[PDB]
């Protein structure tokens, strides 16, 4: 009965821990009824009625009453609970709530729904957050209703709560971070080396210096190593704010745990098989490589037994359960097993492959170098115009008609060649490949320059050289090897720069800044956060097993211990505004500004799959951001006066990407134009850019010959048995040059995991909850965005089905370019654009 205290009917949906992360000895059930009694209490907070302090009034401690089992639309191992609050109309309208978990074990709170049949009828709270036992928290967990507000629009009673929650999220910059902590802060990459285990595992700190600038990462606070105070000590779990590590109902969907298992468990098992000489140490012919996805590879019983039961890992190979591991057939060989060897495919993959964003237009000949000849010797190119086959065109005609392009790794790799070549089993060249756009619209490679630095007293007699296309004799073998050296350069740049640096590492500082300065009520927070899903989690796991000293990348890629620092050298030239698709195309000389076109740019290679499909996605995102922003910012002054926004941007730049705060190109955030730009670029990088460079890894690189990760020797001298091998056994010559069999098994496994779409992925044009905001306007705009993406996909399908575009969109491998199709089912699909860098 009501006595100046009326009742509000509410429903709590939560997931018991044994749902998102289960294992036999991890189901401490204590079913539904244990959540009753005095186990969980919530308190409504008023958004309209305030106390003597200006803070909204707080209701009574209310405990769950019972298990609600009414609506079908409730899945994912979720449970609904009935609860009633004593909230008289005088208490105003609830806009938030406190929650205390008195149980020992934490649970995952999905939402609260107040069916307050009066005003708006229904008040919704989308929580999606783990609630640990109350004794573990310094302050009570607070959640807000799904309303959106810029700081100036926050209801007065909620103003203090909004700011306190942000202060809580920031922490104070000290202390070892714990599992239940939700503290976002920055730190340099000083956690990769392992000096305490060995001086050989000591690595330079990346970030915080002019020698090694680098984006910041999430602070973990484990403390100094015993031997080095600048290096953070080892830890079995690399912390990420609690909700950044949400589980999966299905174990097979926890793809990010794969790298740890592969490095620590699978790799040592593979190694033993080789140490015991139970399998040939090297591939002896191309068929030995093809065998991996056909009949498979035979390994010792206990190596199969070590692999076969592991979650995620067991999904990577088919097995007989005793001796065979069989990898899935890579997309690149599904129609033709030899097409990867063609010059047509080599050039096509530069515009439609795994790394379609490095090629540049060449407007002068010969190509020039900006490196010091005093250090590296004469840097003039040795490629002669007269030696090239440009389909009848003269050099001047090719240059003027904008038909000359290049894949230039000369200046990028030259500074590292000497030190990489001093390593055992690592030999590389700083390569440059010249390409010509034929009249038929396809690209053809016309020359490759294999350069080596030359200094006084060089012990090595190896010299630089230019290799030209050849289809027969030893010359054809030399040209095939030349393409291999180029792809090793490309694979390394792709893995470390196009992929790791530009997406994973560049985005983390924005994730941290967003949680530290934009409240969950903020429209820009709601706009950006979906594009951060799993990013910090995958990054922390990467720092621990992928990019760490002796981790997966160092043990499978050419640069070895120099891998990650090379990406710091490249970061010196990373420009935020150049990450925008149009600016990138223009900067690389593959497109020119053209106001008369729909996208504002004219492509110099009209059928450049990545760029043409990408511009369509870029346009759809821009339209969405341009429609969303106005809903909350009427004029430029509103942007300038948003305190959270200014704080967020100031920190993202001066702290997150602090080593480059001194650059002239950082956008200011004083106008509506600036805001749309920064958000558009962030969303682009997290979704489409990452998808384009990530999901083709196994599809193209699943055949080691197509995408070698390392080279082990330079070209042989004419009078040596190695030279004789090129003439007599070119397959063996090729295999001895590229990645060895053991590291191949490990790298194929990693890229297989990274190219897989978890079944619980949230794609571009999707949100994890249909009530992310109460604002119907923002909800309409998002609907248009999704409809437009479906429209774009129909168009890309037509492009792939158009025979006149077969040369660049399909190639001799007959693999339709689907990497930029917005949607996809689960698996290794070669399509689908996730909202974020989630793997
Ligand atoms: Fe990735």
From Swiss-Prot:
Changing residue 542 to S: Little effect on reaction profile. Its cofactor is Fe cation. Changing residue 542 to G: Changes reaction profile to produce almost equal amounts of 13S- and 9R-hydroperoxyoctadecadienoate. Its EC number is 1.13.11.12. It is found in: Cytoplasm. Changing residue 517 to Q: 33% of wild-type activity. Induction: The hydroperoxide product serves to activate the resting enzyme. The activation is accompanied by the oxidation of Fe(2+)entadiene structure. The keyword Cytoplasm applies. Changing residue 697 to N/E: Reduces catalytic activity. One of its GO terms (molecular function) is linolenate 9R-lipoxygenase activity. Belongs to the lipoxygenase family. This is Seed linoleate 13S-lipoxygenase-1.
């Amino acid at each position: 009965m009501f006595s100046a205290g009326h009742k509000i009917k509410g429903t709590v949906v939560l997931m018991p821990k044994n749902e998102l992360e289960v294992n036999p000895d991890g189901s401490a059930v204590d079913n539904l009824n244990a959540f009753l009694g005095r186990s969980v209490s919530l308190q409504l907070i008023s958004a309209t009625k305030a106390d003597a302090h200006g803070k909204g009034k707080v209701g009574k401690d209310t405990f769950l009453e019972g298990i609600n089992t009414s609506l079908p639309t409730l899945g994912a191992g979720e449970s609904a609970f009935n609860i009633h609050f004593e909230w008289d109309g005088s208490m105003g309208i609830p806009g938030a709530f406190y929650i205390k978990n008195y149980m020992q074990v934490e649970f995952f709170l999905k939402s609260l729904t107040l069916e307050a049949i009066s005003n708006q009828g229904t008040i919704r709270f989308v929580c999606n957050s783990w609630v640990y036992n109350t004794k573990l928290y310094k302050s009570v967990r607070i959640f807000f209703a799904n309303h959106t507000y810029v700081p100036s629009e926050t209801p007065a009673p909620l103003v203090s709560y909004r700011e306190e929650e942000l202060k809580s999220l920031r922490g104070n910059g000290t202390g070892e971070r714990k599992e239940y902590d939700r503290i976002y802060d920055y730190d340099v990459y000083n956690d990769l080396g392992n000096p305490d285990k060995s001086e050989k595992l000591a690595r330079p700190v990346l970030g915080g210096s002019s020698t090694f600038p680098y984006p910041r990462r999430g602070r973990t606070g484990r403390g100094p190593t015993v031997t080095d105070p600048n290096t953070e000590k080892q830890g079995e779990v690399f912390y990420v704010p609690r909700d950044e590590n949400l589980g999966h109902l299905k174990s097979k969907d926890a793809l990010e745990i794969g790298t740890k298992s592969l490095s620590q468990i699978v790799q040592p098992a593979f190694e033993s098989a080789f140490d015991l000489k139970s399998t040939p140490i090297e591939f002896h012919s191309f068929q030995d490589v093809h065998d991996l996805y056909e009949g498979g590879i035979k390994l010792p019983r206990d190596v199969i037994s070590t692999i076969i039961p592991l979650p995620v890992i067991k999904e990577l190979y088919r097995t007989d359960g005793q001796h065979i591991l069989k990898f899935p057939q890579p997309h690149v060989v599904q129609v033709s097993q030899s097409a990867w060897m063609t010059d047509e495919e080599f050039a096509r993959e530069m515009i439609a492959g795994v790394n379609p964003c490095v090629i540049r237009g060449l407007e002068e000949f010969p190509p020039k170098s900006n490196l010091d000849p005093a250090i590296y010797g004469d840097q003039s190119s040795k490629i002669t115009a007269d030696s090239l086959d440009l389909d009848g065109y003269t050099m001047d005609e090719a240059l003027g008609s904008r038909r000359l392009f290049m894949l230039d790794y000369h200046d990028i790799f030259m500074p590292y060649v000497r030190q990489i070549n001093q390593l055992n089993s690592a030999k590389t060249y700083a390569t440059r490949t010249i390409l010509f756009l034929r009249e038929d619209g396809t690209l053809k490679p016309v020359a490759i320059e294999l350069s080596l630095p030359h200094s006084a007293g060089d012990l090595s007699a190896a010299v630089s050289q230019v290799v030209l296309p050849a289809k027969e004799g030893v010359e054809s073998t030399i040209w095939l090897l030349a393409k291999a050296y180029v792809i090793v350069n490309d694979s390394c740049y792709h893995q470390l720069m196009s992929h790791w640096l530009n997406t994973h590492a560049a985005m983390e500082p924005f994730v941290i800044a967003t949680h530290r300065h934009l409240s969950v009520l903020h429209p820009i927070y709601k706009l950006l956060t979906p594009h951060y899903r799993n990013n910090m989690n995958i990054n922390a796991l990467a720092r621990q097993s992928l990019i760490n000293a002796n981790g997966i990348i160092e043990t499978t890629f050419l640069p070895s211990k120099y891998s990650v620092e090379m990406s710091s050298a490249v970061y010196k030239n990373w420009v935020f505004t150049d990450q925008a698709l149009p600016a990138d195309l223009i900067k690389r000389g593959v497109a020119i500004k053209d106001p008369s076109t729909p996208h504002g740019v004219r492509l110099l290679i009209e059928d450049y799959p990545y760029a043409a499909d990408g511009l369509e996605i870029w346009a759809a995102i821009k339209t969405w951001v341009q429609e969303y922003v106005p809903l909350y910012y009427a004029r430029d002054d509103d942007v300038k006066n948003d305190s959270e926004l200014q704080h967020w941007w100031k920190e993202a730049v001066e702290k997150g990407h602090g080593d480059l705060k001194d650059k002239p190109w950082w956008p200011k955030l004083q106008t509506l134009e600036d805001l749309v730009e920064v958000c558009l670029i962030i969303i682009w990088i997290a979704s489409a850019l990452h998808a384009a460079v990530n999901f083709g890894q196994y599809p193209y690189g699943g055949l080691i010959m197509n995408r070698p990760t390392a080279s082990r020797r330079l070209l042989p001298e004419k009078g040596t048995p190695e030279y004789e091998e090129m003439i007599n056994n070119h397959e063996k010559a090729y295999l001895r040059t590229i990645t060895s069999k053991l590291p191949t098994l490990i790298s194929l496994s990693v890229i297989e995991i990274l190219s897989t779409h978890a079944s619980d992925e949230v794609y571009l044009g999707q949100r994890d909850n249909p009530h992310w905001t109460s604002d119907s306007k923002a909800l309409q705009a998002f609907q248009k965005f999704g409809n437009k993406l479906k429209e774009i996909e129909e168009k890309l399908v037509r492009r792939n089905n158009d025979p006149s575009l077969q040369g660049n969109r399909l190639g001799p491998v007959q693999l339709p370019y689907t990497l930029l199709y917005p949607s996809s089912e689960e698996g290794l699909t070669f399509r689908g654009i996730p909202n974020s860098i989630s793997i």
